[PDB]
Amino acid sequence: CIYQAYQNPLRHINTGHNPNNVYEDIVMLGDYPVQNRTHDKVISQTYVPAIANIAFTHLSKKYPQAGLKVDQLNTLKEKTWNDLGVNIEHEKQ
Amino acid sequence: VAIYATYIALSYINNIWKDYVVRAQFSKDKELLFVTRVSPFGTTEEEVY
Amino acid sequence: LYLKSTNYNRFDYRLKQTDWGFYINNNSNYIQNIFSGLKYIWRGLRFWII
Amino acid sequence: MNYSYKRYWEPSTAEVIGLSLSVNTISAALTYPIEFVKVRSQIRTEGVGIRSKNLYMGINPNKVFREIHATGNGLRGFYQGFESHLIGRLSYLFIRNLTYKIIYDRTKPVKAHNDLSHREKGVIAGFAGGLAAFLTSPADLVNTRTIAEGGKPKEWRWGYKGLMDGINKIAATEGGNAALFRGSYANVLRAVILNISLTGPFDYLNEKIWITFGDMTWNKYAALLWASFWGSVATLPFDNIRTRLYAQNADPTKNRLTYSGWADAAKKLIQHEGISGFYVGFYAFYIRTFLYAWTTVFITDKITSDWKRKAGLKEWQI
Amino acid sequence: NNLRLKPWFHWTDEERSHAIFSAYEKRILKSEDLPSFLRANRINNVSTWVFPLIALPLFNQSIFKLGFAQRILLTRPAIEWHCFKIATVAASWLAWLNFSPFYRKLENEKEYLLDTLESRIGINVLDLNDALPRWTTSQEYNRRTQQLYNQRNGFFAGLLYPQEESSRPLVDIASFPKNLHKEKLTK
Amino acid sequence: ESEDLDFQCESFKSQHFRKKGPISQYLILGLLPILYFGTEFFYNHYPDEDYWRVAHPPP
Amino acid sequence: GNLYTWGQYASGTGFETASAVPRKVDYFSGNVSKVAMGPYHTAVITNDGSLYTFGWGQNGALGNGAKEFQLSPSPVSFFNDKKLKVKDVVVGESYTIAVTENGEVYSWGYGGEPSSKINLDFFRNAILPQRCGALGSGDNKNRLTPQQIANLKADGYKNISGGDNFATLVNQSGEVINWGTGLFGSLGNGSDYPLFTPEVNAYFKHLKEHEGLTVQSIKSAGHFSAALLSNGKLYTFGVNTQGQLGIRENLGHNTDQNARLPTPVVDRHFVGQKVVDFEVGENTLVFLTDKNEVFFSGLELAYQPIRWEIPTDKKIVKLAASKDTFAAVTETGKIYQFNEFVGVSTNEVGNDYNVADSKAFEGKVVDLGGSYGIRFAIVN
Amino acid sequence: GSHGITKISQTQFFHQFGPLGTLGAVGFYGLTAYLYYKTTIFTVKKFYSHCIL
Amino acid sequence: FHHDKGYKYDVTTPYDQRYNYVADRLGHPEILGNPFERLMRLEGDIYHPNYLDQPFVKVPNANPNASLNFEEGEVLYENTRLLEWAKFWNYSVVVGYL
Amino acid sequence: NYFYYLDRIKKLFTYLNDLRKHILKKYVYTINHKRIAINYL
């Protein structure tokens, strides 16, 4: 295992079984395969549409061109207030 | 002996208490059941069925 | 802290160039499951502390 | 052992020079054919290396000797270049002995039963041998070229007919006196290695066998065998590289495998033949070195014992 | 006695400080010999903790303006420039820790105290050393000595802490009973 | 290691045949009694350093 | 037009202090034509052919006859005095090459001469090949001022590009002429010995003769180079410091240290696709293929080319690569970036990319470039 | 400092463990560096005492 | 084909042609290998790439199927005093064992 | 190439390491009765 790669690291978990200088682990140190979606119950979403509607209506009363609509909740939630030009701090109360 | 006796006792107590169900809640569509059961130290542990 | 972060990391880039079809690249924000390693360590060492 | 030496009598510089010159002269006259066979074997194996297996791995010195003798020149063919070899050896011995004796006299310990450590003695011997080899390199070059002439094709031969003739031809044809120092670095390295790899093992084994079997007469010769073997093992690669560099003809076309230096020659040898290629003619080299050392030690010990007895030293002091 | 090896010629700084503290707490060394050592220790600590603060501006003014420093600053990443600055500062600080005149003076004062102890209790000064616990350093032992000095010279030298004066009973060791037996175990 | 099934293939060519190799070590094998006894007595100086030395009467 | 510069250090940036955010340079009155940024110095060709070199003048670089830092832009006297227009410029570690409109080629900078009379060159020459530079002089002598390369004409050449200490010229007929240090297959000629004088690439000549493959272009950075041929394939050769070559079949095999001869990149992820163009940075290689698909290798992340997940809706117009960063500019002017290339990023982020802020540059980014720690943008 | 990463937070190791993992790695590196410095100074002192003196 | 041990018919089945896993939607993160095990460097057979690369059937995905929705609904069963009973019994047994 | 000798030396190192592994597998870790008997002899 010196200057010649015989085993396949893609079919091994740890490449340190035998001394070598031509093998590297596929899952290096600091790499952690973790599921991107866990089996955790999500918070109830019953009142989220109403909260979004109320907040968007109030904010549109001050920013008519902000385009704050309930139908855009799936896409609006991914943007920040600075991108929308809305100062949520003043209107939070 | 001490280490393994403690480990065996705790693990088997947890296994005995695992079967019992503390809480059960359906999902919104009633497709999954979230079950809260006893942990090794008597706290809540989550599972999905 | 994680305002501007790419959903991929070194492991995802390495996996994109391998034949391991049983793993998929992360495509969700890590904030939801941040610091799950601590909980996994606790699960691993729970029965050994005493 | 740091106080086990008995340097109760030390020869004068003139005595050392004369005795060394005479003894080395007779030793070289006796052992020259073995060196000739070794050089011819190295030349004939250059670029090919050992290709036999197991017990046959190497070149047979007896086969080489028989092939050389079959040419019809008799035993006179094995002494070709002997004048150049003797002149070079005498110059090397003179320079090395003078430098070593001067340094040793300058830095000797006051007590008669104490001697310089083997490390310091090896340092001094290596320095003296390197200086002498650098000074007297051209003679070795001429001798090796004359020896390799027979092995090489006639068109590639140099056709030297004496030390002075060869020196003049090298200076004129190749251009400039700088051509007289070809292989000087390799010769210096060989001399240093040989000087440092002989005096250590000899004393090592001599003292160990004295401790084991007590004071006997075969101890010196057993230690000589051990030291000669280890010196050959340590020095043969450098001698082979020096021979290759000397045999390298000036015209690149003539050379079967041209070299640019010591490192280049070593790389080419490794590439075209295994690491064992450095040890072609090892048996011949070992026989040559052992015979030379044995005759020199025997004659020097006899003469030194006679001189000590004349001076009046006690039996144990001698 | 230049060629005479003192009993503690092989003791480290930690061992010497521990010996001083042990002598002071056992009352072999009186409180009247400490103040110079305490002042030297405090000065050494101040110098050790203040050296980099004074050195880094000096490096900015003198060294970091040199040709090679400017080359590194202008031709390599700012991170590498910071690494070079930190490395040189750390090397200078280590050199100071090794060869501080204040550290040398503190060691000399410790040597004087050890000489006084040797004169007072003969060769038994070697009995003041023990297997010092790991990670306990000469600075820690000096701090402990300073704390004991403050406790003994404070207002609570007899209310909250033991007094410096010794009130041991006056008896004869050659005849007074001993708590341990040479070979056997007593009841 | 973890890429090959633990089994013996049908082909008989997989049989592990013994083939003679280098012969140098067999020189030491043949000389082993000499070497072993030398190590036992001369190297370890057993039973003492004077038994194997040439005998000399006391002064 | 106007220039914009940024990077980790301010050697060839034209300023005295580094700045991650782009800084506007208007020393050229909107007449910048070409810019070449090396590790420590930069060369700019204006519309009228004037050449301005600035940065670290080590080994007689910048064509000024000195060996000191000259951060501010300054004209090249050798060309300005004679009014000899410069067509193209190549900047390397410590050398610069200029190709004029008449075909004449000049060079100046490091040539491989020993730094000092005392050194370990005696031991180094017995292990490694003799040091050599990108100068076509024929000897290891530094050129403090521009000097013409003898027997070297470049008229109508397809491309010219140089690495740290080597240079290559691909002509209109597909002939490739290389010079400099060919160690570790930097030149792709299969020999590690230095080439003091220009020589025709035997490997490329043989390829053209037998297989009929013509070298479309060659781009080099550091000790690595990549060549695009007539077919839609990239061939890499050099030192694979961080997987730039993209020739690792098995991710866990460290057998791709270097490639003496041009080896094709791994076509696993773009089977059936032809590379449209490519860009090479110090530790990266990013190429666009005719499906409007961007693939990248290097940065110690991808040892074989893998697809960048930027949207393919808008055709990719320009590519740029640099140390640990790269970017792609689309038709609409949108700039996608892997790592902080521009230095300013918007809140729009993707799986493996960000969007550079358009407010950094005052105008439309006509060109982007820079491959050694410092990056530049030509904005009109 | 590798792959263009300029922040600790951009590491999956930090994602999984965080500040405590960073502290552990820093402590390990510092300990090994301290031991390396100690052995290096010991070797330098030995060289000065033996080879020179 | 493997000359020393293989046969003419040793043809591998493509991964895309391997049968999919449809037994259940819930994921099986055991295949991934938890971060604790990864950090400890422990080698487990459950998350070994070679053993996971089955010839004819795909192993279940570590993540739950996108069809499943994990939004909480309504509680069916709830016996909270079991936690207190378990804590009491566990502490009592630990104390007695000590 | 400029490192043909180095390539040969690398081949030698690979051969030596492979021989070490083979010897350990065949004569140290082996369970073959004939090899065990030869070692016993």
Ligand SMILES: CCCCCCCCCCCCCCCCCC(=O)OC[C@H](COP(=O)([O-])OCC(O)COP(=O)([O-])OC[C@@H](COC(=O)CCCCCCCCCCCCCCCCC)OC(=O)CCCCCCCCCCCCCCCCC)OC(=O)CCCCCCCCCCCCCCCCC
């Ligand atoms: C392999 C089998 C594996 C499987 C097992 C199979 C079954 C077998 C099992 C065997 C089990 C063990 C049996 C023995 C019992 C254990 C040992 C024991 O108890 O013995 C007592 C033990 C051994 O000593 P001793 O025999 O009693 O004698 C001690 C006396 O002080 C005497 O000291 P001295 O100063 O008088 O010495 C004189 C010195 C003077 O010799 C010289 O001439 C030296 C100066 C000139 C040399 C020029 C050479 C040029 C070569 C070409 C250029 C260089 C490249 C080539 C490679 C070399 C350079 C790296 O020469 C000698 O030492 C003569 C005896 C040795 C033969 C000569 C060859 C070796 C010389 C050492 C250097 C080369 C080492 C190569 C690597 C190791 C090979 C085995 O005694 C001690 O406790 C003292 C030890 C002192 C230190 C030496 C320790 C041994 C060597 C260590 C490695 C050295 C490496 C050096 C090179 C490093 C890289 C640069």
Ligand SMILES: CCCCCCCCCCCCCCCCCC(=O)OC[C@H](COP(=O)([O-])OCC(O)COP(=O)([O-])OC[C@@H](COC(=O)CCCCCCCCCCCCCCCCC)OC(=O)CCCCCCCCCCCCCCCCC)OC(=O)CCCCCCCCCCCCCCCCC
């Ligand atoms: C991968 C390797 C791993 C390690 C193992 C190593 C294995 C090696 C072999 C296999 C591999 C291939 C080789 C690799 C070599 C690598 C090293 C290297 O670079 O060496 C090349 C180096 C040089 O080789 P080269 O480059 O081929 O050149 C040699 C040519 O033969 C030179 O040509 P030439 O022979 O025709 O010489 C002509 C002569 C022409 O003569 C001249 O010098 C001309 C100029 C001066 C003229 C005047 C001279 C004096 C007279 C006038 C004085 C003034 C007037 C006085 C009054 C009037 C009366 C005279 O020139 C010379 O004298 C020499 C050339 C330099 C001349 C320039 C000026 C030098 C000034 C300083 C020296 C002065 C004193 C020199 C003489 C000695 C003292 C007496 O050779 C070596 O180092 C030898 C081998 C290595 C030895 C050390 C041992 C290392 C290994 C230790 C064991 C390791 C074991 C563990 C494994 C470790 C793994 C890493």
Ligand SMILES: CCCCCCCCCCCCCCCCCC(=O)OC[C@H](COP(=O)([O-])OCC(O)COP(=O)([O-])OC[C@@H](COC(=O)CCCCCCCCCCCCCCCCC)OC(=O)CCCCCCCCCCCCCCCCC)OC(=O)CCCCCCCCCCCCCCCCC
């Ligand atoms: C305005 C009014 C202000 C009034 C003042 C008060 C209020 C203001 C704030 C006060 C704040 C107080 C802070 C106190 C703590 C810090 C100071 C302290 O106690 O020092 C310990 C130490 C205590 O010693 P000492 O009692 O004074 O005795 C000194 C005697 O002369 C003879 O002693 P020695 O030298 O023989 O003994 C040296 C050392 C014996 O050597 C050792 O034992 C050290 C072994 C290696 C430790 C490595 C740790 C990693 C960090 C290393 C340092 C930073 C990186 C350096 C990088 C250098 C290269 C660039 O002894 C010890 O110190 C033993 C301590 C062992 C406990 C270690 C604790 C755990 C460490 C690991 C933590 C992470 C993992 C576990 C986490 C667990 C979580 C639950 O202080 C020193 O003496 C150090 C002197 C300076 C040495 C500098 C060396 C080079 C590094 C500095 C330059 C580069 C800096 C780069 C970063 C810059 C930006 C941050």
Ligand SMILES: CCCCCCCCCCCCCCCCCC(=O)OC[C@H](COP(=O)([O-])OCC[N+](C)(C)C)OC(=O)CCCCCCCCCCCCCCCCC
């Ligand atoms: C004044 C009158 C009184 C008597 C005076 C003395 C008479 C003449 C004596 C002449 C010298 C005789 C000895 C010559 C050498 C040995 C014999 C011989 O022919 O050899 C020539 C051999 C040559 O033999 P050759 O084999 O070449 O002979 C010719 C061969 N054919 C026919 C094939 C062409 O040696 C040489 O001539 C060259 C080397 C000489 C120098 C080196 C000598 C080394 C050996 C020295 C030690 C002693 C050797 C003898 C040992 C046995 C006897 C003790």
Ligand SMILES: CCCCCCCCCCCCCCCCCC(=O)OC[C@H](COP(=O)([O-])OCC[N+](C)(C)C)OC(=O)CCCCCCCCCCCCCCCCC
């Ligand atoms: C990675 C490769 C790096 C290569 C380059 C850098 C590393 C170089 C390392 C060199 C090591 C040299 C070791 C010398 C041999 C010592 C061996 C030893 O200790 O043996 C035990 C003995 C120790 O003997 P002792 O004196 O202690 O006593 C022996 C007896 N008893 C055991 C009872 C005490 O030493 C020797 O026998 C050494 C003899 C040789 C000494 C001379 C060596 C060469 C010196 C050359 C000087 C310069 C010449 C001129 C040069 C001109 C051009 C510049």
Ligand SMILES: CCCCCCCCCCCCCCCCCC(=O)OC[C@H](COP(=O)([O-])OCC[N+](C)(C)C)OC(=O)CCCCCCCCCCCCCCCCC
């Ligand atoms: C009593 C105990 C003490 C004993 C002291 C006395 C001396 C002991 C000497 C022991 C060593 C003996 C060596 C024998 C050498 C071989 C002899 C022979 O005939 O075989 C020739 C053979 C073959 O030689 P060859 O290659 O020249 O063969 C020539 C081949 N043809 C003919 C085709 C040209 O040698 C070998 O096969 C190799 C021998 C050396 C093995 C070395 C093993 C150790 C390697 C360690 C490397 C570590 C590297 C670390 C750096 C990082 C690496 C990535």
Ligand SMILES: CCCCCCCCCCCCCCCCCC(=O)OC[C@H](COP(=O)([O-])OCC[N+](C)(C)C)OC(=O)CCCCCCCCCCCCCCCCC
């Ligand atoms: C092990 C740790 C060291 C580092 C890692 C390993 C790297 C080095 C590996 C070297 C392996 C051995 C190489 C040489 C193999 C020779 C094989 C052989 O015998 O060829 C047939 C040759 C043939 O020679 P011949 O031509 O005389 O043939 C006579 C035989 N007939 C007549 C039948 C042809 O045999 C010999 O020469 C026998 C003696 C060989 C001695 C080899 C010694 C090698 C030493 C190299 C380093 C220098 C010495 C250093 C130590 C001592 C001094 C301090």
Ligand SMILES: CCCCCCCCCCCCCCCCCC(=O)OC[C@H](COP(=O)([O-])OCC[N+](C)(C)C)OC(=O)CCCCCCCCCCCCCCCCC
């Ligand atoms: C048959 C002999 C050749 C065997 C070759 C194969 C085996 C390898 C070599 C084994 C050793 C061979 C004997 C000589 C060296 C002994 C060294 C030793 O430790 O002895 C010290 C021992 C005692 O040493 P000591 O008692 O001072 O201390 C030894 C070390 N301590 C302190 C740890 C105890 O001495 C003896 O046993 C006397 C040995 C006398 C041998 C005489 C015959 C051989 C001499 C000529 C050899 C010529 C060829 C070169 C050698 C063979 C080829 C390399």
Ligand SMILES: CCCCCCCCCCCCCCCC(=O)OC[C@H](COP(=O)(O)O)OC(=O)CCCCCCCCCCCCCCC
């Ligand atoms: C004794 C101290 C001497 C002073 C210098 C000490 C430090 C030397 C550090 C460099 C050593 C070489 C590293 C490998 C370089 C390389 O190309 O490494 C790669 C090449 C091989 O390239 P490939 O990847 O193509 O195979 O390796 C070699 O060529 C190794 C040759 C042997 C080297 C032996 C060790 C050095 C010997 C001493 C003289 C060194 C002179 C030159 C110094 C720069």
